[PDB]
Symmetry: C3
Subunit: 90 residues, 3 copies
Amino acid sequence: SSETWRFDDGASLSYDWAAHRYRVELPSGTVEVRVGASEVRVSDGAVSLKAPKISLEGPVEIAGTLTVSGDILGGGSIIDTAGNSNHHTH
Amino acid sequence: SSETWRFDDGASLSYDWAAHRYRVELPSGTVEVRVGASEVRVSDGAVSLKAPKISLEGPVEIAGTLTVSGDILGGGSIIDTAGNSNHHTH
Amino acid sequence: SSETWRFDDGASLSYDWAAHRYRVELPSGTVEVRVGASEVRVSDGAVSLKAPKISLEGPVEIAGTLTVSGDILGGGSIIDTAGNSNHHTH
Ligand SMILES: [Fe+3]
């Protein structure tokens, strides 16, 4: 169903024609693509996106906790399940 | 302005020197880059980032609805347009 | 510690075996990967993800301000530091 090439570095490339799935895998290290001042980096510890604007076009689902250093501005409702702040007055 | 290579799989590579734009395109399937336990995957149904930390460095603009399974913690204001919860007490 | 290849376009590829770090760099332009209707694009002005679903699996840390055009739905608490709306009633 698939084939794999293993490189001298331990990295591999695999291609499953029964899925059209291409996989590049490194056991450890960092892969980075930079264009101007924008970067996508994939490393053992993180996936990092850095750019003048990071645009996510579609429904976004975070499986985890979201921490934002700056403000959070929503064009609709902002609805919790377990608690929000009383940092406002009626 | 550009040139294109079409592969036997239906995939293509194109390069516009009048924009310095490189495009790799697959009609269907999955492309994945894995480094350690971190992954970026692009498939017909999703773009998926999986990592011990997902770092977005810059202004983030979501064109869509954001769902977070865990908590949302903001270092500044969290301001809606259309409604927030009363899950707090004055 | 590393080696670099510089292309006729000003782009470069570098590999540090003392880090297993691969870097592709373009001074200016756009690099795009498309699979079906999903895309990851890296350009001078932005990193853009577009897909039927954008899945972020792990803790997400935004260093910047987050703007969401649609709703924000949290499965836990949503806690600010500096202010939230009074768009609700007790
Ligand atoms: Fe209140």
